Each structure stands twice: as structure tokens, then as C-alpha cells.
Design a protein around this ligand. Structure first.
Ligand SMILES: O=C(O)CCC(=O)C(=O)O
Ligand SMILES: Cc1c[nH]c(=O)[nH]c1=O
Ligand code: NI
Length: 335
């Protein structure tokens, strides 16, 4: 059974490239081989690349064009649909500079003045019918006619891919193929549209420590990351070095989040990643677009060690937790 050349292979970090159609359409042997490859990727790197996913490239291109049209809106129109609370986790955001005030501790004043916020903006969409948390959609005029219908369609197709990736994980683990279905079928996911504005490379010298997206781990089960061809995404290697996650045409980068790491009793890795300058020399870095679809267990789900991820009970590292509660704690922490 032919395995593809790794998407990334540097400094001990090996991120496999996997043809997802072989899990969905292959005979039983090929299906299992592919599922095991997916699982092995999550167990080692915490990251995989998938090609030939059910989401069509022309639709993805349209979704990116539609996203670009949103971010071209004037600042006042974007702020009108602003991110409000961590428990909603929906709407427009752009990181601002912290201000010095009467209340600030003088030890922190030097840091605040020299701090460089991430050069990015985002717009987050949740499932439409979540009680108490409506999506703040912008008005549908001119270029934004079709915005909602496009993004809701994309949301549901990514929701479907989440279910299938978890099925691959289950098949790879040798547990019931549909084990995760009842934990993920609600689609309590977040569609994060990202725009990193064009920026002069000198900005990164004027502001040392400046990045496009600060280093972090994702919170949920998995993240489906669709990136354009600009580059800048980096994944931390097992030797502690950030390695370039090179863009590959018509792939989706998939990584496990902290909840899946915990759920798997740390058999699956949630790996630190960031976005920095693209690895090419140029005076001006053009705009970068990406879409992060954060997949989560159902907010009602109780998360405890998956069967087959431990032998003796003493090997369980974590107490059970409610999924929804965990996420809001992560979202609310910074504020
Ligand atoms: O833009 C990217 O490629 C990464 C975005 C990301 O890691 C995130 O939004 O959590
Ligand atoms: C990084 C991150 C931000 N917002 C979310 O909802 N989930 C995540 O994993
Ligand atoms: Ni991330």
C-alpha cells in the first residue's frame, strides 16, 4: 500500500500527507491502512495534511473569495458585528494595543509600550441554531450578497469532514468505527475566517517579537486549517524548533487540539504552532488568508479517557471534564 511523501520532514517533525479519499472509498485493507496512517500522524506530530477531501477545490476558492470580500468591508461595518463574549465566541475581532493607565503596575509599563499585537483580523461563525448564541451576520449588500449562504454551506461541509476524520481515528484505534459520532454530531464548531493584512517586512524589525499569529495550542478535538500559498505557518518539532508547514495546493492541514489530547490520555498530541513572516525575502508581504475550522465535542459531552488508550486505570492522567465548560475557560482566560 503506497504511502505519500511526507508534507513536512525536518528536525524530527514528520507530518504525513494522506489521501483521504482512500479512507472514504478504499477497500477494507486500504481503509484500515489509511486510518492507521492518520492516527499515527496524530500520535506523533499532532498534525497531518489531507488531500482529496470531499470539499471541492472550486467551492473552497469561492469561500476564500467570499472571506476576502468580508475583510474588505470598512472598519465600522466589521466592528458592528464584533466579537462579544467568550461563551458566544462569534463575530469580528482584531487585536489592539494595551494602554498604560493609572491602574497599571510600573513593572509592566515597559512591556506594554514595547508590545507588538498580532497583525491579523478574524471573523468567527458558530452553528446557526445554537440556543442563545446567534451569529452576528453582516448586511447582505453589494459584494456580500451570498456571504451567509456560502459560509453556512462551508460550515456544514467541514462539520461532515470532522465526523469522518474522527471515524478514521476510531478505525485506526481499532474501536467501534462510529464511537465518536454521538460525541460530535451536534456540530458545536467555530468557523474562523482569518485575514493577515499586507505588511512591510521592516515592521518585523521595528517591532522585534512581532508575529502574524502568536504561538499556541488549539483547544478542541481537531482543527481543519485551509491556507493559501503565502506561507508562514510553523509547527513546533519534538526538538523544540519551529518548522515551516509548507503550503501544498488543495490540501487541508489537520491538527489535534488540547481536548482530544486529554481525551486520548495523551496518546494523541496537541502541538504548538504559530504564524510568522513567510520564509521568502521581500520588501512587502502580500495579504495572507486562511480559514481555521475549530472542531469540538458536543458542548454537553463528558470527556474521559477513550477505550484502548490505557491498560490499568492508574495510567489515566486526567479527571473527567465537561467539554463546553473547558472551552469557555480557555476562551475566557485572556478576556
Ligand atoms: O492562519 C494559520 O495558518 C493558523 C491559524 C491558527 O493557528 C488559529 O487560528 O488557531
Ligand atoms: C485557538 C482557538 C481559538 N478559538 C477557538 O474557538 N478554538 C481554538 O482552538
Ligand atoms: Ni491554531
Amino acid at each position: 500500500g503506497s504511502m505519500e511523501k511526507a508534507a513536512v520532514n525536518e528536525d524530527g517533525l514528520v507530518i504525513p500527507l494522506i489521501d483521504f479519499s482512500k479512507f472514504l472509498e478504499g477497500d477494507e485493507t486500504l481503509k484500515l491502512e489509511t486510518a492507521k496512517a492518520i492516527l499515527h500522524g496524530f500520535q506523533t506530530a499532532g498534525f497531518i495534511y489531507l488531500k482529496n477531501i470531499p470539499i471541492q477545490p472550486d467551492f473552497r476558492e469561492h469561500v476564500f473569495n467570499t472571506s476576502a470580500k468580508f475583510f474588505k468591508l470598512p472598519k465600522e461595518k466589521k466592528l458592528e458585528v464584533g466579537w462579544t463574549t467568550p461563551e458566544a465566541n462569534r463575530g469580528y475581532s482584531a487585536p489592539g494595543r494595551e494602554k498604560v493607565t493609572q491602574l497599571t503596575d510600573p513593572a509592566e509599563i515597559e512591556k506594554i509600550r514595547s508590545a507588538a499585537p498580532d497583525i491579523k483580523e478574524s471573523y468567527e461563525i458558530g452553528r446557526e441554531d445554537e440556543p442563545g448564541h446567534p451569529n452576528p451576520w453582516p448586511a447582505e449588500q453589494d459584494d456580500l450578497v451570498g456571504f451567509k449562504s456560502t459560509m453556512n454551506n462551508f460550515f456544514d461541509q467541514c462539520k461532515a469532514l470532522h465526523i469522518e476524520v474522527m471515524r478514521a481515528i476510531a478505525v485506526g484505534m481499532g474501536i467501534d468505527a462510529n464511537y465518536f459520532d454521538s460525541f460530535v454530531d451536534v456540530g458545536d464548531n467555530i468557523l474562523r475566517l482569518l485575514h493577515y493584512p499586507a505588511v512591510k517586512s521592516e515592521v518585523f524589525k521595528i517591532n522585534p517579537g512581532q508575529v502574524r499569529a502568536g504561538e499556541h495550542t488549539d483547544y478542541g478535538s481537531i482543527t481543519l486549517l485551509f491556507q493559501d500559498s503565502r506561507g508562514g505557518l510553523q509547527v513546533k518539532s519534538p526538538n523544540g524548533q519551529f518548522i515551516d508547514a509548507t503550503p501544498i495546493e488543495n490540501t487541508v492541514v489537520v491538527n489535534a487540539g488540547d481536548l482530544l489530547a486529554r481525551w486520548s490520555n495523551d496518546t494523541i498530541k496537541s502541538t504548538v504552532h504559530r504564524v510568522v513572516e513567510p520564509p521568502k525575502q521581500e520588501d512587502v508581504h502580500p495579504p495572507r488568508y486562511s480559514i481555521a475550522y475549530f472542531c469540538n465535542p458536543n458542548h454537553k459531552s463528558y470527556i474521559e479517557a477513550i477505550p484502548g488508550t490505557y491498560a490499568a486505570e492508574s495510567e489515566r492522567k486526567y479527571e473527567g471534564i465537561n467539554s463546553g465548560k473547558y472551552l469557555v475557560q480557555r476562551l475566557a482566560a485572556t478576556y
